[PDB]
Amino acid sequence: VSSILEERILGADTSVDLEETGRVLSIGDGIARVHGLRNVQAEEMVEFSSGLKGMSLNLEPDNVGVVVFGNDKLIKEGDIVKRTGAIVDVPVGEELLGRVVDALGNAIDGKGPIGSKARRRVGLKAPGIIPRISVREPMQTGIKAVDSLVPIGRGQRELIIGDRQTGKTSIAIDTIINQKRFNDGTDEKKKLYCIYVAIGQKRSTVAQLVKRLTDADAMKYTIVVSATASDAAPLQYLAPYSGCSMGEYFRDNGKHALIIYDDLSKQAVAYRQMSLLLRRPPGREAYPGDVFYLHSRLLERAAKMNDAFGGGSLTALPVIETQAGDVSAYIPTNVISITDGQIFLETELFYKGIRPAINVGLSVSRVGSAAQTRAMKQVAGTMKLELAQYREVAAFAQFGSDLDAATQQLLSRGVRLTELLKQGQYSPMAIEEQVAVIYAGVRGYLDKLEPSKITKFENAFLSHVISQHQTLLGKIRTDGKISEEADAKLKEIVTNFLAGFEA
Amino acid sequence: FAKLVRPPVQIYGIEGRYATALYSAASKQNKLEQVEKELLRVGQILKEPKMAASLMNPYVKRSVKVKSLNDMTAKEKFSPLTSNLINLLAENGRLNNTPAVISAFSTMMSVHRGEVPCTVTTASPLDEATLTELKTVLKSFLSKGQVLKLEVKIDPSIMGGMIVRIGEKYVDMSAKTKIQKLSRAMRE
Amino acid sequence: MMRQKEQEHMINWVEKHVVQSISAQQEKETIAKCIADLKLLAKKA
């Protein structure tokens, strides 16, 4: 009470000062033509007298198009618009961790104010060719399919593209839930601070998302940034730049950070609304020209930093939905063109039975084997080549073109590895169990074993290896490579377990 | 082209374009106040109901509009600036826009005099000693060599008062916005 | 939740009481402080 009194009466300066303003013309639909600001700078946070920010774009000789950060009822024609004096900025700290933060800095979750220290400009320039260095660290997701065919690098951007309702947000949350075991460990290089920018979603999906992360105890890497549907179109526009600025703070301090841009097409459609209300000419699908420049800034804010610049990395993974699987639409071609890694879900495998539904050969990671551990590189290259062989031989021998022993070998190993890559929702596993199970799948011992029985093989095999083989998995994950004694030991343990599986 | 003489306030639009042309011409030939008082006399003329009824109505055959305005010019003996100005507005058909170009060129000449359009809201009917000391401190406050033209308006809604807008600079000690600043302070 | 709703009740009654009193408060030291503020911005301008 009394502390509230004294903070209210000491905190506000009430330091009046002469200040540039300008009256307001047409306040249309969140856009306001403001006459008068002859010294406003382009893309600047400006302030409507009812207490609400707007961002000044589209500086014209008549007037400035300020697009508002919120509701439109609270603005009339003829009121003042005060210049704040600086570009729109995001308050970033490490005390911002584990707290849902509305798109500017405003933590709307009911857990007090944010204890920020480091304000940061949000429209910053990304690093050049010298401050960047290449991908080195293996960004693991816990998904067997991602970490064994399209592995991520700490230092990298990699799409999650699909159609609606396929498992893309679920892949992003598997990626989040994996990294708990690296945060609570010892190495700072393993530890994770991630930023989940939910663009244009609904508030109950973000609420149940925070429920899943709190129940999975995720709230020390995580920073959830919600610009939901009821938020204004510039809050949905500006939210992934805010998450990028928080990720750039962690990166330039030297902590391995990532950002999941969930539903990045909602940023594209909110910026389409903004351009068509500020009367810019429409381009293709009524999206304007610089949507590629928009996502190109947003996604080239991330690669590994130099060893003299802290060594912190950023992993941008944006989630994008197509419509009817049309990859040739404007926003998917732009966002595939800017990124390099991309994970393709076609959906017919989701209804066919593999989970997560990576339908695959469209998906590629350009950094490839450089972003794997040494064991997963030693095991899972022949798996990718075998899956390529399997897909093409099944595609022409759909009807039984020619079946020698080689073709039934290819279909057998392909179907068995297809049921290897199935994995339940919200259950990420570490890298050493993945090396163990893809060793049990690729290096023999599963080729003639009745493909419906692969899932019980998975369950009993993980139970076996977590039961009496924890120190050997410690040897595998800490030694890096899977050594030759560990190789023959995995051979012996999978043979013993094949006996105990036909027991 | 010819070097267009820069006006002090860029009024934009159609009427601002006509007014910048007229200002640059009248500043080349250096008869600016003469052209301003003649445009004020024209704006007094074209508010007559017979002349404005003849002009705003179509199907009065634009050549006859040009002839009528040239005969009205040759009757009251305008200068050769505003004569060609009214003839150009008649030829283009933007005689609907002539009180707005008179307003725009009047604004440009009022800035050429050096006036500053001061706005003050005391939010209560203020007295003459307050107005005297306010004009004194505000004339000292604006700049050197410029004259202010102040207006005052009132409303009981905004408590306290004394907002002052002088030359885009808007100082605001209103009690309502003080409660609004303390309001943003108290909700956090 | 007790301190939250008492805080909301407190802050709204404070704002309403401020409107109630300062809406009916005029003694011209408001205008005197305001002309002093224009004088101070004149001295610093």
């Binding site: 009194l5 | 009690a175 303390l182 | 407190m10 401020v18």
Partner: peptide
Amino acid sequence: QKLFVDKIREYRTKR
């Protein structure tokens, strides 16, 4: 210090 000291006074009166 015009307004906020009056607000202080009303903080006392609600207190």
